[PDB]
Amino acid sequence: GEPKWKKNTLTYRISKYTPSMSSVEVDKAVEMALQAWSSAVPLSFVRINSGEADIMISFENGDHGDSYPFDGPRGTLAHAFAPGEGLGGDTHFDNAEKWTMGTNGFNLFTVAAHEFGHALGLAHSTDPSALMYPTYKYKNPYGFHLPKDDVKGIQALYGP
Ligand SMILES: COc1ccc(S(=O)(=O)N(CC(=O)NO)CC(C)C)cc1
Ligand SMILES: [Ca+2]
Numbered sequence: 001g002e003p004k005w006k007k008n009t010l011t012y013r014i015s016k017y018t019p020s021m022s023s024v025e026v027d028k029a030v031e032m033a034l035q036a037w038s039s040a041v042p043l044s045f046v047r048i049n050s051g052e053a054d055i056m057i058s059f060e061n062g063d064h065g066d067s068y069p070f071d072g073p074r075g076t077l078a079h080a081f082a083p084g085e086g087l088g089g090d091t092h093f094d095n096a097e098k099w100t101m102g103t104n105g106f107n108l109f110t111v112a113a114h115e116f117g118h119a120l121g122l123a124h125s126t127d128p129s130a131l132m133y134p135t136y137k138y139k140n141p142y143g144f145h146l147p148k149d150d151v152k153g154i155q156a157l158y159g160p
């Protein structure tokens with residue numbers, strides 16, 4: 001089959017955060033990114049209290065048990081896993097740089113919707129308006145959900 005998901009009710013658990021934002025502000029920053037995908041297809045992300053989730057999220061510095069480490073004060077803001085089970089679906093954020101709700105540091109919202117996109121089964125599209133754009137592409141954080149092609153993409157994974 002395809003390596004993407006066999007169910008539409010996915011699980012999530014946090015284990016770490018950025019210093020620049022509080023835990024509630026980071027949950028509140030991702031909530032907007034979850035909804036965008038739950039607008040493109042009938043899926044949902046259910047936050048757990050007891051069991052290693054489909055999607056586990058953490059902040060890590062350089063080597064972290066991936067042959068692809070973090071890179072420090074620029075470049076890779078966030079690297080997600082592809083869909084799977086174990087490391088699969090788990091999304092990793094860089095602790096060597098700076099996060100916020102604005103343009104100076106890294107907009108956790110603008111970064112997050114793209115990385116959730118990878119834990120689904122999607123790839124870097126590079127399309128002049130797409131969300132999986134490999135460059136930290138600046139979308140207006142005002143109901144913008146996905147641009148377009150990212151919607152036809154996720155429809156192919158969970159089923160229309
Ligand atoms: C707007 O969302 C983005 C978030 C992080 C990056 S990244 O620089 O961390 N990067 C890894 C990744 O898969 N993130 O989604 C792609 C990089 C090759 C530009 C790029 C875009
Ligand atoms: Ca997992």
Ligand SMILES: [Ca+2]
Binds near residue numbers: 072075077096097
């Ligand atoms: Ca980085």
Ligand SMILES: [Zn+2]
Binds near residue numbers: 064066068079
């Ligand atoms: Zn990793």
Ligand SMILES: [Zn+2]
Binds near residue numbers: 114115118132134
């Ligand atoms: Zn990416």
